[PDB]
Amino acid sequence: TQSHYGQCGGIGYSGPTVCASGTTCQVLNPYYSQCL
Ligand SMILES: *O[C@H]1O[C@H](CO)[C@@H](O)[C@H](O)[C@@H]1O
Ligand SMILES: *O[C@H]1O[C@H](CO)[C@@H](O)[C@H](O)[C@@H]1O
Numbered sequence: 001t002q003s004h005y006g007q008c009g010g011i012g013y014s015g016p017t018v019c020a021s022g023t024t025c026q027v028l029n030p031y032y033s034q035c036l
Contacts, residue, residue: 002035009033 001018002008008017008025010032019025019035027033 004035006035007033008035 001020002016002023002025003020004023006019006023007013007015008019009027012031013033017025023035025033026036
């Protein structure tokens, strides 16, 4: 999983695709998505 405020889904993204065990993968823009 990702950390808090980290990335979980973007066009230029390769890190953890799931958000922190206390954070949620909420999409931002069609090129960026982060963990809250
Ligand atoms: O995925 C989330 O939890 C993991 C541990 O269970 C961490 O490795 C990760 O970075 C996230 O916080
Ligand atoms: O979650 C923490 O680690 C991530 C990298 O795996 C970062 O993107 C994030 O901002 C935190 O530093």
